[PDB]
Amino acid sequence: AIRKKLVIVGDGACGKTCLLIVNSKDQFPEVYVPTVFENYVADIEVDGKQVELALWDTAGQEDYDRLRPLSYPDTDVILMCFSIDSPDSLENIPEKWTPEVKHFCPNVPIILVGNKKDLRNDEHTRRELAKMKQEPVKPEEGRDMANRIGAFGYMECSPKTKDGVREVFEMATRAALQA
Numbered sequence: 007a008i009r010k011k012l013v014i015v016g017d018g019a020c021g022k023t024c025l026l027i028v029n030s031k032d033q034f035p036e037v038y039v040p041t042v043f044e045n046y047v048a049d050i051e052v053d054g055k056q057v058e059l060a061l062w063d064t065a066g067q068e069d070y071d072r073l074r075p076l077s078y079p080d081t082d083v084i085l086m087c088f089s090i091d092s093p094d095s096l097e098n099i100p101e102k103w104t105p106e107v108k109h110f111c112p113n114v115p116i117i118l119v120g121n122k123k124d125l126r127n128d129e130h131t132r133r134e135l136a137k138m139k140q141e142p143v144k145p146e147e148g149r150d151m152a153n154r155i156g157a158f159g160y161m162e163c164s165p166k167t168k169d170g171v172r173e174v175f176e177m178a179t180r181a182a183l184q185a
């Protein structure tokens with residue numbers, strides 16, 4: 007079986023840990039974990055061959071900036087996340103996450119992931135953003151950002167509803183196999 011390492015990065019509260027949990031497990035207890043602290047793998051078949059993906063979670067808050075690069079050695083694919091309910095998290099993609107990953111993971115493919123797709127049409131989300139004259143991220147803004155940062159692709163998903171999640175890991179596997 008082919009062995010590849012995936013790392014997930016992005017602002018806090020954007021759904022990173024949930025994305026890793028929903029694709030790897032059938033049940034998760036009632037506990038909040040900042041990062042997956044157990045060895046989670048994704049077993050994916052692509053083009054008629056079996057790939058095993060080690061999934062490495064990170065903490066996006068600034069207090070962790072100094073220790074986060076311990077997760078980067080020998081990465082084969084990056085999932086770089088923002089949340090569709092947070093325009094601020096999208097702004098941090100070119101400003102923080104892109105230069106950090108390009109430094110520690112040179113030439114490693116990046117999948118830009120717009121998480122929490124279910125909140126784009128959520129009434130409560132729309133009201134909370136609207137009160138500050140904001141709105142959910144539009145798909146065209148994510149495509150534009152993937153062009154700006156040189157990502158391998160842009161995908162949207164919801165760890166909550168599961169929509170789009172399998173496709174994220176399949177494209178990440180395809181990307182990891184190119185090099």
Ligand SMILES: Nc1nc2c(ncn2[C@@H]2O[C@H](COP(=O)(O)OP(=O)(O)O)[C@@H](O)[C@H]2O)c(=O)[nH]1
Binds near residue numbers: 020021
């Ligand atoms: N509505 C919605 N909430 C989500 C989704 N994914 C995660 N969440 C919630 O967002 C919060 C943060 O998720 P988490 O995975 O801990 O984010 P992380 O800080 O990036 O690891 C939690 O309350 C999750 O239950 C989603 O697709 N839709």
Ligand SMILES: [Mg+2]
Binds near residue numbers: 022024039063
């Ligand atoms: Mg987390």
